[PDB]
């Protein structure tokens, strides 16, 4: 079990850790989050009480170092930083714990939610989508645009998701115009899986990362990326059987975890109706279909 201490909490903020969150008051003695499960990525995120615009946060993995949060009154936000002095860090963490100024990562033992949402997500791939290689953790916020969005401005701040475009040369073999546009199996298996992602796990990892960024920060280009990667699978007549069963599990927990009040901007009517009811894989997402109908029958 690992710990992310906070230097202070000068401004009233709602702090999130993974799917959990806490209200912290201006200069409340808050000094961190303990008992964070080792073995998965995590995200700590923020929404100031004074600006319900720009949710922002940091993806990290405690195995990759000792990380803490510190408010910067110049830039006006909580910043993640790395402490290189291992002893100075054990020291701060022990004193804050002794003083019991830290909240406990509130995992119920029966609950595999965070594991199910992050099963294929790996820090190394996150850092390639969010390029800032002088840090071991990754900043994301509500407003960051994707590389594909930028094609249709500042690239240092871009989400470098893999570009998927169904009406592109990449996606359509010359001579198989009709075949490839109606059956995207070529694009999925040869171009994307074998070519770019190398395996299904990297593909699922980017899909899950995209969803989590759309959920936690309302990042709109992430939501576009999540739907595109779903649509590519569902729109492919020939998909490995293990990918379909795993996809059904992945989407189920994503839909399960989504806030009910956000289904209107986070869920694209067309993609979902096509995937669940028209696509080649209409019959391959039983759990995802059952939870969608019983929870959001309006969208369908």
């Amino acid at each position: 079990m690992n710990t992310v201490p906070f230097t202070s909490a000068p401004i009233e903020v709602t702090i999130g850790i993974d799917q959990y969150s806490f209200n912290v008051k201006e200069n409340q003695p808050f000094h961190g989050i303990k008992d964070i499960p080792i073995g998965h990525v995590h995200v700590i995120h923020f929404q100031h009480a004074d600006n319900s615009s720009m949710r922002y946060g940091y993806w990290f993995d405690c195995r990759m170092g000792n990380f803490y949060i510190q408010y910067d009154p110049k830039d006006g936000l909580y910043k993640m930083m790395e402490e290189r002095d291992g002893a100075k860090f054990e020291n701060i963490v022990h004193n804050f714990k002794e003083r019991q100024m830290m909240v406990s990562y509130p995992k119920i033992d029966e609950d595999d939610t965070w594991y199910n949402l992050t099963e294929f997500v790996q820090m190394d791939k996150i850092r390639k989508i969010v390029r800032k290689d002088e840090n071991q953790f990754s900043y994301v916020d509500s407003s960051m645009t994707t590389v594909q969005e930028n094609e249709l401005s500042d690239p240092a701040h871009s989400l470098n998701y893999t570009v998927i475009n169904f009406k592109s040369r990449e996606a359509i073999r010359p001579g198989h115009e009709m075949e490839d546009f109606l059956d995207k199996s070529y694009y999925l298996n040869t171009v994307m899986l074998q070519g770019i992602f190398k395996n299904s796990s990297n593909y699922f990892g980017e899909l899950q990362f995209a969803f989590l960024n759309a959920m936690f920060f309302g990042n709109y280009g992430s939501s576009l990326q999540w739907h595109a990667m779903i649509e590519l699978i569902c729109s492919s007549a020939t998909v490995p059987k293990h990918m379909l069963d795993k996809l059904d599990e992945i989407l189920y927990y994503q839909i399960k975890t989504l806030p009910e009040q956000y289904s209107d901007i986070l869920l694209n009517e067309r993609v979902w109706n096509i995937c669940l009811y028209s696509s080649f894989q209409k019959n391959s997402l039983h759990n995802t279909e059952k939870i969608m109908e019983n929870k959001y029958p309006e969208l369908l």
């Binding site: 009406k167 592109s168 040369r169 359509i172 115009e177 009709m178 546009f181």
Partner: protein, 237 residues
């Protein structure tokens, strides 16, 4: 964006563009089988690709053989249309390739777009206009060459005959669409009006009769009258 009544004069500027109409690509007769079930029999069809400024028509004849052993023919028809339009553009010298292609039915956008991926700078546009090009097979010479074809064939025509020697493309297009509108709403009456007078013949290299300016005025009024009468009939107005 879409073509509509507002941006209608852009058809007659000097940017090359083509209308593509696919309504007559896949054509069937429906009949009863011996066991009493219904079956279709395909007849020869055509893609109607028209330069509205110059009157050059690129009539790509679609032979029934292209459907042999194919499924979901109405959907295939759209992809075959886009394939043939794409091949036409590629066959044209660069300075003749269109800058826009306007599809008369929205279902053609995705197939054409995919087939034109090699020409990113050719815009594929839909239209809000309700154009009567399906009536092209009411023009006797066009129907004839389509039905007699024994293989895929491209046939070139000027759909304006020689009108442009005397009138503008705007006026030519308005005349064409008025004639075709009439032919579409009441083919028998429309065709009666055009041929009633045996002294006004069609040149071997033309599609329509050799009317004088004044005779075109009487014709165009007779087509107008036809169209409004059929409207009152349709809607009991």
């Amino acid at each position: 964006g879409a073509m509509n009544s507002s941006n209608y004069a852009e058809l007659f500027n000097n940017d090359i563009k083509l209308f593509v109409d696919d309504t007559n690509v896949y054509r069937v007769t429906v009949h009863k089988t011996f066991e009493g079930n219904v079956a279709t029999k395909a007849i020869n069809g055509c893609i109607f690709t028209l330069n509205p400024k110059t009157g050059h028509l690129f009539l790509k004849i679609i032979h029934t053989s292209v459907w042999a052993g194919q499924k979901r023919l109405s959907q295939l028809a759209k992809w075959k249309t886009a394939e043939e339009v794409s091949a036409l553009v590629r066959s044209l010298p660069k300075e003749e390739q269109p800058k826009q292609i306007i599809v008369t039915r929205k279902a053609m956008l995705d197939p054409l777009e995919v087939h034109m991926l090699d020409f990113p700078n050719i815009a594929i546009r839909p239209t809000e206009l309700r154009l009567p090009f399906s009536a092209a097979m009411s023009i006797d010479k066009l129907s004839d060459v389509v039905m007699k074809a024994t293989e895929p064939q491209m046939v070139l025509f000027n759909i304006y005959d020689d009108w442009l020697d005397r009138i503008s493309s705007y006026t030519a297009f308005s005349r064409l669409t008025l004639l075709l509108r009439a032919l579409k709403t009441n083919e028998e009456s429309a065709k009666m009006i055009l041929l009633s007078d045996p002294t006004i013949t069609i040149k071997s290299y033309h599609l329509w009769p050799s009317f004088t300016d004044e005779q075109w005025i009487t014709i165009e009024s007779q087509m107008r009258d036809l169209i409004l009468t059929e409207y009152g009939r349709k809607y009991n107005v």
